[PDB]
Amino acid sequence: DAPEKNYERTMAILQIESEKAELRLKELEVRRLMRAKGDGPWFQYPTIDKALIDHSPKATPDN
Amino acid sequence: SWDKDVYPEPPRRTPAPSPQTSLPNPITYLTKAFDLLVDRPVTLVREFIERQHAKNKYYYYHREFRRVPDITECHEKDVLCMFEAEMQWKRDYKVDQEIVNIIQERLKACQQREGESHRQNCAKELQQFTQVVKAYQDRYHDLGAHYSARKCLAKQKQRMLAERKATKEAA
């Protein structure tokens, strides 16, 4: 291979791998913030549905 | 051939043959025999091969590297620039190594050709060798086997802070 081919192929390899490395660091920081705060779409543990609640006028008024 | 400025030789001064005795030395006969028997067939074969070279004259070139930005103007953890800076510094490192090798060849050739008086007659080559070894040692020594342009720049910053502190404490 030419030294041009090896050189610019190495530059493309380094761009792809540096982008993957910065994205892995971003992925870890996103996981840390979402587990700590719980305001993201991940770690949304289930709660109780409010559609199960019956809002009909019951037998006694104080409820 | 080569360049006589990068590889200097002082002019050859051979003395004239001044025979004092009457006995003929064998060396003139041996030089004539080496010219007739040996030098002329070698010259004929070299002329034949050189005439075969002249039938197809093509060329090889010297590889030019244009100057990319060095490691000082590369951002931290920016591999697309500091890769180019690292390769540039490694090529400059090979070049500086070969410069030191050329000056070693000058020192050794002076120590041979000046004979017994080489301690006087090779002070210029010794001073050039001392300068280039001092510069090479300030530039690339003690870096380690994982040498990089970051290591060399950190060594240069350490040496410059030492020089600046030695200047300020001598103010």
Side-chain angles (χ1 to χ4, degrees):
Chain A
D1 288 331
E4 291 83 3
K5 185 172 183 179
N6 192 5
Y7 192 81
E8 294 175 352
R9 181 176 61 191
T10 305
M11 289 179 66
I13 290 164
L14 289 175
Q15 187 193 9
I16 294 169
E17 292 288 330
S18 66
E19 287 178 354
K20 289 197 285 185
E22 292 292 327
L23 285 175
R24 289 186 182 99
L25 291 173
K26 286 183 180 180
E27 196 266 334
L28 294 179
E29 185 66 28
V30 166
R31 290 182 70 186
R32 188 188 68 84
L33 292 171
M34 286 182 179
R35 187 187 286 272
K37 291 190 284 184
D39 54 354
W42 305 347
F43 300 100
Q44 293 295 316
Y45 298 113
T47 60
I48 299 170
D49 191 1
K50 69 179 180 66
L52 297 174
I53 300 170
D54 193 4
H55 295 91
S56 296
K58 300 291 190 295
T60 68
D62 293 331
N63 53 8
Chain B
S1 178
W2 62 94
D3 197 359
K4 303 294 187 291
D5 292 329
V6 60
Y7 293 103
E9 293 179 354
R12 290 179 179 90
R13 293 184 294 114
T14 184
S18 298
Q20 189 267 332
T21 187
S22 65
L23 297 177
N25 53 357
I27 304 164
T28 61
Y29 292 97
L30 289 164
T31 304
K32 291 183 184 292
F34 189 80
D35 198 2
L36 269 297
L37 296 175
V38 180
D39 197 3
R40 292 182 67 250
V42 169
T43 303
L44 289 173
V45 175
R46 183 66 182 170
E47 285 176 352
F48 180 76
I49 297 168
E50 187 175 1
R51 288 189 299 272
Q52 298 306 109
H53 290 299
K55 293 179 182 178
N56 46 3
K57 180 62 67 67
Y58 68 99
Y59 297 107
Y60 74 103
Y61 299 102
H62 179 74
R63 187 177 287 272
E64 294 290 328
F65 287 100
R66 64 174 62 92
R67 304 290 293 166
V68 294
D70 57 351
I71 202 68
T72 61
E73 55 184 357
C74 293
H75 294 283
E76 185 174 0
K77 288 167 90 284
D78 190 359
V79 295
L80 274 305
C81 297
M82 73 188 292
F83 171 71
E84 297 174 349
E86 181 71 28
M87 298 302 107
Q88 190 188 12
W89 179 74
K90 286 185 178 180
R91 291 191 301 269
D92 291 334
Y93 178 57
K94 291 184 290 186
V95 166
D96 291 331
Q97 288 181 356
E98 297 295 326
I99 290 170
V100 176
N101 288 323
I102 290 167
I103 303 304
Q104 286 183 355
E105 290 182 356
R106 285 182 180 175
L107 189 65
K108 289 184 282 186
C110 191
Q111 201 274 333
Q112 179 62 39
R113 75 178 66 250
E114 292 295 328
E116 188 68 28
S117 62
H118 63 89
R119 188 175 294 114
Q120 179 181 2
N121 291 320
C122 298
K124 182 177 89 274
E125 288 84 3
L126 184 60
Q127 194 267 333
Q128 290 177 354
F129 180 72
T130 304
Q131 291 300 110
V132 70
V133 164
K134 179 65 167 65
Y136 187 85
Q137 189 178 4
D138 289 331
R139 185 175 290 178
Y140 299 125
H141 198 202
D142 287 332
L143 295 180
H146 293 284
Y147 60 91
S148 68
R150 288 173 59 191
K151 265 67 179 299
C152 185
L153 183 63
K155 184 182 178 183
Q156 181 175 359
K157 288 184 180 179
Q158 181 177 0
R159 186 178 66 248
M160 288 181 68
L161 289 176
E163 289 174 351
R164 190 184 71 186
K165 186 180 183 294
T167 302
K168 186 174 73 68
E169 75 183 3

mmCIF file of all heavy atoms in Angstrom, chain A residues 1-45:
data_model
loop_
_atom_site.group_PDB
_atom_site.id
_atom_site.type_symbol
_atom_site.label_atom_id
_atom_site.label_comp_id
_atom_site.label_asym_id
_atom_site.label_seq_id
_atom_site.Cartn_x
_atom_site.Cartn_y
_atom_site.Cartn_z
ATOM 1 N N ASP A 1 0.826 -1.195 0.000
ATOM 2 C CA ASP A 1 0.000 0.000 0.000
ATOM 3 C C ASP A 1 0.865 1.251 0.000
ATOM 4 O O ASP A 1 2.019 1.241 0.436
ATOM 5 C CB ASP A 1 -0.919 0.018 1.219
ATOM 6 C CG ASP A 1 -2.025 -1.000 1.127
ATOM 7 O OD1 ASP A 1 -2.441 -1.323 -0.004
ATOM 8 O OD2 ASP A 1 -2.489 -1.472 2.184
ATOM 9 N N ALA A 2 0.292 2.338 -0.500
ATOM 10 C CA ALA A 2 0.976 3.614 -0.487
ATOM 11 C C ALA A 2 1.035 4.159 0.938
ATOM 12 O O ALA A 2 0.216 3.790 1.782
ATOM 13 C CB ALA A 2 0.254 4.601 -1.396
ATOM 14 N N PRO A 3 2.014 5.016 1.245
ATOM 15 C CA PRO A 3 1.987 5.701 2.547
ATOM 16 C C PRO A 3 0.831 6.674 2.683
ATOM 17 O O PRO A 3 0.388 6.935 3.809
ATOM 18 C CB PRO A 3 3.341 6.420 2.593
ATOM 19 C CG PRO A 3 4.198 5.660 1.663
ATOM 20 C CD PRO A 3 3.303 5.204 0.562
ATOM 21 N N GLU A 4 0.334 7.210 1.565
ATOM 22 C CA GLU A 4 -0.881 8.018 1.581
ATOM 23 C C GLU A 4 -2.078 7.198 2.029
ATOM 24 O O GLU A 4 -2.898 7.664 2.832
ATOM 25 C CB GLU A 4 -1.146 8.590 0.191
ATOM 26 C CG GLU A 4 -0.159 9.635 -0.277
ATOM 27 C CD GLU A 4 1.106 9.055 -0.887
ATOM 28 O OE1 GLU A 4 1.204 7.814 -1.002
ATOM 29 O OE2 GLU A 4 2.004 9.843 -1.253
ATOM 30 N N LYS A 5 -2.188 5.971 1.510
ATOM 31 C CA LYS A 5 -3.314 5.103 1.824
ATOM 32 C C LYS A 5 -3.318 4.723 3.296
ATOM 33 O O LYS A 5 -4.340 4.858 3.975
ATOM 34 C CB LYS A 5 -3.263 3.860 0.938
ATOM 35 C CG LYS A 5 -4.446 2.939 1.088
ATOM 36 C CD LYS A 5 -4.415 1.852 0.038
ATOM 37 C CE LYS A 5 -5.636 0.968 0.136
ATOM 38 N NZ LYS A 5 -5.639 -0.098 -0.899
ATOM 39 N N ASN A 6 -2.159 4.301 3.814
ATOM 40 C CA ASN A 6 -2.027 3.973 5.231
ATOM 41 C C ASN A 6 -2.269 5.194 6.108
ATOM 42 O O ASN A 6 -2.947 5.097 7.134
ATOM 43 C CB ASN A 6 -0.637 3.399 5.500
ATOM 44 C CG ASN A 6 -0.511 2.762 6.872
ATOM 45 O OD1 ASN A 6 -1.475 2.657 7.625
ATOM 46 N ND2 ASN A 6 0.697 2.346 7.207
ATOM 47 N N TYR A 7 -1.773 6.359 5.687
ATOM 48 C CA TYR A 7 -1.862 7.574 6.491
ATOM 49 C C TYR A 7 -3.306 8.050 6.632
ATOM 50 O O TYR A 7 -3.810 8.247 7.746
ATOM 51 C CB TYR A 7 -1.006 8.649 5.828
ATOM 52 C CG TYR A 7 -0.744 9.883 6.638
ATOM 53 C CD1 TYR A 7 0.246 9.893 7.603
ATOM 54 C CD2 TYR A 7 -1.466 11.044 6.421
ATOM 55 C CE1 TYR A 7 0.504 11.014 8.333
ATOM 56 C CE2 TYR A 7 -1.214 12.177 7.150
ATOM 57 C CZ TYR A 7 -0.228 12.151 8.104
ATOM 58 O OH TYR A 7 0.037 13.272 8.839
ATOM 59 N N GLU A 8 -4.001 8.204 5.508
ATOM 60 C CA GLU A 8 -5.364 8.709 5.553
ATOM 61 C C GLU A 8 -6.354 7.644 6.010
ATOM 62 O O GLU A 8 -7.375 7.978 6.629
ATOM 63 C CB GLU A 8 -5.726 9.272 4.185
ATOM 64 C CG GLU A 8 -4.888 10.492 3.848
ATOM 65 C CD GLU A 8 -5.126 11.016 2.458
ATOM 66 O OE1 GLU A 8 -5.835 10.345 1.684
ATOM 67 O OE2 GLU A 8 -4.604 12.102 2.138
ATOM 68 N N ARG A 9 -6.051 6.365 5.772
ATOM 69 C CA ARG A 9 -6.834 5.288 6.357
ATOM 70 C C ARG A 9 -6.699 5.270 7.870
ATOM 71 O O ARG A 9 -7.688 5.057 8.578
ATOM 72 C CB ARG A 9 -6.390 3.966 5.743
ATOM 73 C CG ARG A 9 -7.116 2.744 6.217
ATOM 74 C CD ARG A 9 -6.616 1.563 5.422
ATOM 75 N NE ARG A 9 -5.189 1.343 5.624
ATOM 76 C CZ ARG A 9 -4.457 0.514 4.893
ATOM 77 N NH1 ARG A 9 -5.015 -0.175 3.910
ATOM 78 N NH2 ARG A 9 -3.165 0.371 5.146
ATOM 79 N N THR A 10 -5.494 5.539 8.385
ATOM 80 C CA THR A 10 -5.295 5.654 9.824
ATOM 81 C C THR A 10 -6.059 6.841 10.386
ATOM 82 O O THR A 10 -6.630 6.754 11.477
ATOM 83 C CB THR A 10 -3.806 5.787 10.139
ATOM 84 O OG1 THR A 10 -3.098 4.690 9.557
ATOM 85 C CG2 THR A 10 -3.574 5.771 11.633
ATOM 86 N N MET A 11 -6.110 7.947 9.642
ATOM 87 C CA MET A 11 -6.873 9.103 10.109
ATOM 88 C C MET A 11 -8.368 8.811 10.161
ATOM 89 O O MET A 11 -9.056 9.244 11.095
ATOM 90 C CB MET A 11 -6.595 10.312 9.228
ATOM 91 C CG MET A 11 -5.220 10.884 9.410
ATOM 92 S SD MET A 11 -4.971 12.268 8.309
ATOM 93 C CE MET A 11 -6.141 13.429 8.991
ATOM 94 N N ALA A 12 -8.880 8.040 9.199
ATOM 95 C CA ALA A 12 -10.290 7.652 9.241
ATOM 96 C C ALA A 12 -10.583 6.703 10.402
ATOM 97 O O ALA A 12 -11.616 6.843 11.083
ATOM 98 C CB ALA A 12 -10.692 7.013 7.918
ATOM 99 N N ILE A 13 -9.681 5.741 10.637
ATOM 100 C CA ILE A 13 -9.789 4.825 11.774
ATOM 101 C C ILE A 13 -9.793 5.592 13.089
ATOM 102 O O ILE A 13 -10.616 5.330 13.977
ATOM 103 C CB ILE A 13 -8.649 3.790 11.721
ATOM 104 C CG1 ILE A 13 -8.849 2.825 10.556
ATOM 105 C CG2 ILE A 13 -8.535 3.015 13.017
ATOM 106 C CD1 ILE A 13 -7.609 2.052 10.213
ATOM 107 N N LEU A 14 -8.905 6.580 13.215
ATOM 108 C CA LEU A 14 -8.816 7.361 14.441
ATOM 109 C C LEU A 14 -10.032 8.249 14.645
ATOM 110 O O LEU A 14 -10.454 8.438 15.792
ATOM 111 C CB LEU A 14 -7.548 8.206 14.446
ATOM 112 C CG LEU A 14 -6.233 7.456 14.627
ATOM 113 C CD1 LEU A 14 -5.072 8.413 14.488
ATOM 114 C CD2 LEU A 14 -6.195 6.757 15.961
ATOM 115 N N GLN A 15 -10.618 8.780 13.565
ATOM 116 C CA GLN A 15 -11.846 9.558 13.711
ATOM 117 C C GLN A 15 -12.984 8.692 14.226
ATOM 118 O O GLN A 15 -13.686 9.078 15.170
ATOM 119 C CB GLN A 15 -12.261 10.194 12.389
ATOM 120 C CG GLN A 15 -13.432 11.142 12.569
ATOM 121 C CD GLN A 15 -14.083 11.548 11.264
ATOM 122 O OE1 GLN A 15 -13.782 10.998 10.207
ATOM 123 N NE2 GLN A 15 -14.986 12.520 11.334
ATOM 124 N N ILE A 16 -13.158 7.503 13.634
ATOM 125 C CA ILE A 16 -14.251 6.613 14.027
ATOM 126 C C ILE A 16 -14.082 6.144 15.469
ATOM 127 O O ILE A 16 -15.037 6.155 16.262
ATOM 128 C CB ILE A 16 -14.343 5.432 13.044
ATOM 129 C CG1 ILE A 16 -14.763 5.940 11.667
ATOM 130 C CG2 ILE A 16 -15.314 4.377 13.532
ATOM 131 C CD1 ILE A 16 -14.630 4.921 10.577
ATOM 132 N N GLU A 17 -12.853 5.807 15.858
ATOM 133 C CA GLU A 17 -12.635 5.302 17.207
ATOM 134 C C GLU A 17 -12.684 6.409 18.258
ATOM 135 O O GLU A 17 -13.141 6.163 19.381
ATOM 136 C CB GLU A 17 -11.309 4.555 17.263
ATOM 137 C CG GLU A 17 -11.303 3.266 16.459
ATOM 138 C CD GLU A 17 -12.134 2.173 17.088
ATOM 139 O OE1 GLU A 17 -12.253 2.148 18.330
ATOM 140 O OE2 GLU A 17 -12.652 1.323 16.337
ATOM 141 N N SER A 18 -12.273 7.635 17.918
ATOM 142 C CA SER A 18 -12.397 8.726 18.879
ATOM 143 C C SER A 18 -13.850 9.140 19.060
ATOM 144 O O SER A 18 -14.266 9.488 20.177
ATOM 145 C CB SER A 18 -11.552 9.916 18.440
ATOM 146 O OG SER A 18 -12.047 10.469 17.239
ATOM 147 N N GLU A 19 -14.641 9.092 17.981
ATOM 148 C CA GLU A 19 -16.072 9.344 18.110
ATOM 149 C C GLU A 19 -16.748 8.285 18.966
ATOM 150 O O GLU A 19 -17.570 8.617 19.828
ATOM 151 C CB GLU A 19 -16.727 9.417 16.733
ATOM 152 C CG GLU A 19 -16.397 10.684 15.976
ATOM 153 C CD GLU A 19 -17.015 10.713 14.599
ATOM 154 O OE1 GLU A 19 -17.615 9.695 14.194
ATOM 155 O OE2 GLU A 19 -16.893 11.751 13.917
ATOM 156 N N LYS A 20 -16.374 7.009 18.785
ATOM 157 C CA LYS A 20 -16.934 5.955 19.630
ATOM 158 C C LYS A 20 -16.522 6.111 21.088
ATOM 159 O O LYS A 20 -17.330 5.865 21.986
ATOM 160 C CB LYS A 20 -16.534 4.572 19.132
ATOM 161 C CG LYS A 20 -17.209 4.187 17.850
ATOM 162 C CD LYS A 20 -17.125 2.697 17.592
ATOM 163 C CE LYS A 20 -15.752 2.265 17.148
ATOM 164 N NZ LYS A 20 -15.763 0.821 16.798
ATOM 165 N N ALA A 21 -15.291 6.554 21.345
ATOM 166 C CA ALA A 21 -14.838 6.690 22.727
ATOM 167 C C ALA A 21 -15.532 7.844 23.443
ATOM 168 O O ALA A 21 -15.950 7.706 24.606
ATOM 169 C CB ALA A 21 -13.328 6.867 22.753
ATOM 170 N N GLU A 22 -15.685 8.985 22.761
ATOM 171 C CA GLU A 22 -16.418 10.094 23.363
ATOM 172 C C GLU A 22 -17.892 9.764 23.543
ATOM 173 O O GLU A 22 -18.504 10.193 24.531
ATOM 174 C CB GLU A 22 -16.249 11.358 22.525
ATOM 175 C CG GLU A 22 -14.841 11.922 22.552
ATOM 176 C CD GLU A 22 -14.459 12.469 23.916
ATOM 177 O OE1 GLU A 22 -15.347 12.983 24.627
ATOM 178 O OE2 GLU A 22 -13.269 12.391 24.277
ATOM 179 N N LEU A 23 -18.467 8.966 22.636
ATOM 180 C CA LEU A 23 -19.849 8.544 22.822
ATOM 181 C C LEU A 23 -20.006 7.549 23.964
ATOM 182 O O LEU A 23 -21.042 7.555 24.633
ATOM 183 C CB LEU A 23 -20.401 7.957 21.532
ATOM 184 C CG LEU A 23 -20.756 8.929 20.420
ATOM 185 C CD1 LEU A 23 -21.151 8.147 19.201
ATOM 186 C CD2 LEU A 23 -21.867 9.854 20.850
ATOM 187 N N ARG A 24 -19.009 6.693 24.208
ATOM 188 C CA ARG A 24 -19.081 5.795 25.359
ATOM 189 C C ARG A 24 -19.009 6.568 26.669
ATOM 190 O O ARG A 24 -19.720 6.239 27.630
ATOM 191 C CB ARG A 24 -17.964 4.755 25.309
ATOM 192 C CG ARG A 24 -18.118 3.693 24.243
ATOM 193 C CD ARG A 24 -17.027 2.660 24.404
ATOM 194 N NE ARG A 24 -17.051 1.608 23.392
ATOM 195 C CZ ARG A 24 -16.276 1.590 22.314
ATOM 196 N NH1 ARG A 24 -15.398 2.560 22.111
ATOM 197 N NH2 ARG A 24 -16.362 0.590 21.449
ATOM 198 N N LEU A 25 -18.162 7.600 26.720
ATOM 199 C CA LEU A 25 -18.111 8.445 27.914
ATOM 200 C C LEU A 25 -19.418 9.205 28.124
ATOM 201 O O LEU A 25 -19.897 9.328 29.265
ATOM 202 C CB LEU A 25 -16.938 9.412 27.817
ATOM 203 C CG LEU A 25 -15.559 8.769 27.904
ATOM 204 C CD1 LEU A 25 -14.476 9.787 27.635
ATOM 205 C CD2 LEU A 25 -15.375 8.147 29.269
ATOM 206 N N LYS A 26 -20.016 9.710 27.036
ATOM 207 C CA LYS A 26 -21.323 10.358 27.135
ATOM 208 C C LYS A 26 -22.394 9.383 27.600
ATOM 209 O O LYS A 26 -23.269 9.751 28.390
ATOM 210 C CB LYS A 26 -21.726 10.961 25.793
ATOM 211 C CG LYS A 26 -20.994 12.230 25.411
ATOM 212 C CD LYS A 26 -21.538 12.766 24.093
ATOM 213 C CE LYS A 26 -20.850 14.047 23.659
ATOM 214 N NZ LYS A 26 -21.411 14.545 22.375
ATOM 215 N N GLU A 27 -22.330 8.137 27.123
ATOM 216 C CA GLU A 27 -23.300 7.114 27.498
ATOM 217 C C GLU A 27 -23.222 6.803 28.986
ATOM 218 O O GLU A 27 -24.257 6.679 29.655
ATOM 219 C CB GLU A 27 -23.050 5.864 26.652
ATOM 220 C CG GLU A 27 -24.159 4.825 26.614
ATOM 221 C CD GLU A 27 -24.009 3.719 27.632
ATOM 222 O OE1 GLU A 27 -22.872 3.417 28.056
ATOM 223 O OE2 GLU A 27 -25.043 3.117 27.972
ATOM 224 N N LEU A 28 -22.003 6.728 29.529
ATOM 225 C CA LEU A 28 -21.845 6.489 30.962
ATOM 226 C C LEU A 28 -22.350 7.664 31.791
ATOM 227 O O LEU A 28 -22.991 7.462 32.832
ATOM 228 C CB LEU A 28 -20.386 6.208 31.297
ATOM 229 C CG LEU A 28 -19.834 4.916 30.712
ATOM 230 C CD1 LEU A 28 -18.379 4.741 31.093
ATOM 231 C CD2 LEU A 28 -20.666 3.749 31.181
ATOM 232 N N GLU A 29 -22.080 8.896 31.348
ATOM 233 C CA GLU A 29 -22.552 10.049 32.115
ATOM 234 C C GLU A 29 -24.071 10.194 32.051
ATOM 235 O O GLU A 29 -24.700 10.576 33.048
ATOM 236 C CB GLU A 29 -21.856 11.314 31.624
ATOM 237 C CG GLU A 29 -22.183 12.561 32.417
ATOM 238 C CD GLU A 29 -21.674 12.521 33.848
ATOM 239 O OE1 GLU A 29 -20.664 11.839 34.120
ATOM 240 O OE2 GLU A 29 -22.285 13.185 34.709
ATOM 241 N N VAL A 30 -24.677 9.846 30.911
ATOM 242 C CA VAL A 30 -26.134 9.829 30.789
ATOM 243 C C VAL A 30 -26.746 8.782 31.713
ATOM 244 O O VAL A 30 -27.745 9.053 32.391
ATOM 245 C CB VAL A 30 -26.536 9.611 29.319
ATOM 246 C CG1 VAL A 30 -27.987 9.244 29.189
ATOM 247 C CG2 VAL A 30 -26.308 10.873 28.548
ATOM 248 N N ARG A 31 -26.146 7.582 31.775
ATOM 249 C CA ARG A 31 -26.643 6.553 32.689
ATOM 250 C C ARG A 31 -26.523 6.987 34.142
ATOM 251 O O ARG A 31 -27.428 6.731 34.946
ATOM 252 C CB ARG A 31 -25.898 5.235 32.491
ATOM 253 C CG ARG A 31 -26.191 4.509 31.215
ATOM 254 C CD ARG A 31 -25.420 3.207 31.173
ATOM 255 N NE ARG A 31 -25.923 2.223 32.122
ATOM 256 C CZ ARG A 31 -25.340 1.051 32.356
ATOM 257 N NH1 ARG A 31 -24.236 0.721 31.708
ATOM 258 N NH2 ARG A 31 -25.864 0.206 33.233
ATOM 259 N N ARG A 32 -25.430 7.675 34.484
ATOM 260 C CA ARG A 32 -25.241 8.146 35.854
ATOM 261 C C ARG A 32 -26.291 9.182 36.230
ATOM 262 O O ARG A 32 -26.912 9.097 37.299
ATOM 263 C CB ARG A 32 -23.842 8.732 36.019
ATOM 264 C CG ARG A 32 -23.495 9.060 37.450
ATOM 265 C CD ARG A 32 -22.184 9.801 37.549
ATOM 266 N NE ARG A 32 -22.295 11.141 36.978
ATOM 267 C CZ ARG A 32 -22.758 12.198 37.639
ATOM 268 N NH1 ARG A 32 -23.148 12.075 38.901
ATOM 269 N NH2 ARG A 32 -22.821 13.383 37.044
ATOM 270 N N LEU A 33 -26.539 10.140 35.335
ATOM 271 C CA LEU A 33 -27.514 11.185 35.619
ATOM 272 C C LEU A 33 -28.942 10.657 35.629
ATOM 273 O O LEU A 33 -29.759 11.116 36.431
ATOM 274 C CB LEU A 33 -27.374 12.311 34.605
ATOM 275 C CG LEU A 33 -26.072 13.087 34.744
ATOM 276 C CD1 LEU A 33 -25.925 14.023 33.586
ATOM 277 C CD2 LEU A 33 -26.068 13.852 36.046
ATOM 278 N N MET A 34 -29.262 9.692 34.766
ATOM 279 C CA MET A 34 -30.611 9.150 34.750
ATOM 280 C C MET A 34 -30.887 8.232 35.930
ATOM 281 O O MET A 34 -32.024 8.186 36.408
ATOM 282 C CB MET A 34 -30.874 8.388 33.456
ATOM 283 C CG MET A 34 -31.067 9.229 32.218
ATOM 284 S SD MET A 34 -31.394 8.053 30.913
ATOM 285 C CE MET A 34 -31.661 9.034 29.466
ATOM 286 N N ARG A 35 -29.893 7.474 36.401
ATOM 287 C CA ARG A 35 -30.127 6.699 37.612
ATOM 288 C C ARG A 35 -30.180 7.602 38.838
ATOM 289 O O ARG A 35 -30.944 7.330 39.770
ATOM 290 C CB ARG A 35 -29.056 5.616 37.785
ATOM 291 C CG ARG A 35 -29.344 4.661 38.942
ATOM 292 C CD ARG A 35 -28.219 3.692 39.226
ATOM 293 N NE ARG A 35 -28.088 2.614 38.256
ATOM 294 C CZ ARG A 35 -28.741 1.461 38.345
ATOM 295 N NH1 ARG A 35 -29.575 1.249 39.350
ATOM 296 N NH2 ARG A 35 -28.553 0.515 37.438
ATOM 297 N N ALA A 36 -29.412 8.695 38.846
ATOM 298 C CA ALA A 36 -29.423 9.576 40.008
ATOM 299 C C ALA A 36 -30.709 10.389 40.088
ATOM 300 O O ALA A 36 -31.284 10.539 41.170
ATOM 301 C CB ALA A 36 -28.210 10.500 39.976
ATOM 302 N N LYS A 37 -31.178 10.921 38.962
ATOM 303 C CA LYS A 37 -32.320 11.827 38.974
ATOM 304 C C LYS A 37 -33.637 11.163 38.604
ATOM 305 O O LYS A 37 -34.680 11.554 39.138
ATOM 306 C CB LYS A 37 -32.067 13.010 38.035
ATOM 307 C CG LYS A 37 -30.979 13.945 38.533
ATOM 308 C CD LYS A 37 -30.914 15.228 37.730
ATOM 309 C CE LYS A 37 -30.264 15.017 36.383
ATOM 310 N NZ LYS A 37 -30.121 16.310 35.673
ATOM 311 N N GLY A 38 -33.627 10.177 37.712
ATOM 312 C CA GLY A 38 -34.859 9.510 37.350
ATOM 313 C C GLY A 38 -35.782 10.316 36.475
ATOM 314 O O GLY A 38 -36.969 10.003 36.388
ATOM 315 N N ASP A 39 -35.273 11.356 35.823
ATOM 316 C CA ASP A 39 -36.074 12.200 34.953
ATOM 317 C C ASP A 39 -35.933 11.856 33.477
ATOM 318 O O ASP A 39 -36.535 12.529 32.640
ATOM 319 C CB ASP A 39 -35.724 13.676 35.183
ATOM 320 C CG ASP A 39 -34.241 13.960 35.047
ATOM 321 O OD1 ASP A 39 -33.452 13.011 34.877
ATOM 322 O OD2 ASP A 39 -33.859 15.145 35.116
ATOM 323 N N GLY A 40 -35.162 10.829 33.138
ATOM 324 C CA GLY A 40 -35.008 10.422 31.763
ATOM 325 C C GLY A 40 -35.855 9.215 31.422
ATOM 326 O O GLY A 40 -36.512 8.633 32.288
ATOM 327 N N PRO A 41 -35.860 8.816 30.147
ATOM 328 C CA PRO A 41 -36.664 7.652 29.745
ATOM 329 C C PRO A 41 -36.140 6.323 30.249
ATOM 330 O O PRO A 41 -36.904 5.351 30.273
ATOM 331 C CB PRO A 41 -36.624 7.709 28.214
ATOM 332 C CG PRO A 41 -35.398 8.478 27.901
ATOM 333 C CD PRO A 41 -35.257 9.490 28.989
ATOM 334 N N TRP A 42 -34.875 6.235 30.635
ATOM 335 C CA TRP A 42 -34.359 4.998 31.194
ATOM 336 C C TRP A 42 -34.599 5.020 32.693
ATOM 337 O O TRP A 42 -34.815 6.081 33.283
ATOM 338 C CB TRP A 42 -32.866 4.825 30.916
ATOM 339 C CG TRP A 42 -32.461 4.894 29.470
ATOM 340 C CD1 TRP A 42 -33.275 4.847 28.380
ATOM 341 C CD2 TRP A 42 -31.135 5.086 28.967
ATOM 342 N NE1 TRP A 42 -32.540 4.964 27.235
ATOM 343 C CE2 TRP A 42 -31.222 5.120 27.567
ATOM 344 C CE3 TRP A 42 -29.879 5.211 29.565
ATOM 345 C CZ2 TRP A 42 -30.107 5.281 26.757
ATOM 346 C CZ3 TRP A 42 -28.779 5.377 28.763
ATOM 347 C CH2 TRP A 42 -28.896 5.404 27.372
ATOM 348 N N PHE A 43 -34.576 3.826 33.295
ATOM 349 C CA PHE A 43 -34.827 3.600 34.724
ATOM 350 C C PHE A 43 -36.203 4.099 35.152
ATOM 351 O O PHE A 43 -36.390 4.537 36.287
ATOM 352 C CB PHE A 43 -33.733 4.220 35.597
ATOM 353 C CG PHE A 43 -32.376 3.669 35.322
ATOM 354 C CD1 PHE A 43 -31.473 4.370 34.535
ATOM 355 C CD2 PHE A 43 -32.006 2.447 35.832
ATOM 356 C CE1 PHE A 43 -30.224 3.861 34.270
ATOM 357 C CE2 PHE A 43 -30.762 1.930 35.573
ATOM 358 C CZ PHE A 43 -29.865 2.639 34.793
ATOM 359 N N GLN A 44 -37.176 4.048 34.244
ATOM 360 C CA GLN A 44 -38.555 4.392 34.575
ATOM 361 C C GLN A 44 -39.219 3.137 35.119
ATOM 362 O O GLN A 44 -39.857 2.367 34.400
ATOM 363 C CB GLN A 44 -39.291 4.943 33.364
ATOM 364 C CG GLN A 44 -38.768 6.265 32.897
ATOM 365 C CD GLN A 44 -38.980 7.338 33.926
ATOM 366 O OE1 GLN A 44 -40.044 7.435 34.528
ATOM 367 N NE2 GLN A 44 -37.951 8.134 34.167
ATOM 368 N N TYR A 45 -39.041 2.924 36.417
ATOM 369 C CA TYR A 45 -39.641 1.770 37.060
ATOM 370 C C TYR A 45 -41.152 1.970 37.153
ATOM 371 O O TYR A 45 -41.614 3.107 37.270
ATOM 372 C CB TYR A 45 -39.040 1.560 38.444
ATOM 373 C CG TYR A 45 -37.562 1.283 38.407
ATOM 374 C CD1 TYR A 45 -36.655 2.191 38.929
ATOM 375 C CD2 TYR A 45 -37.076 0.093 37.892
ATOM 376 C CE1 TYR A 45 -35.300 1.933 38.910
ATOM 377 C CE2 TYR A 45 -35.727 -0.168 37.860
ATOM 378 C CZ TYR A 45 -34.844 0.752 38.374
ATOM 379 O OH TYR A 45 -33.497 0.491 38.354
#
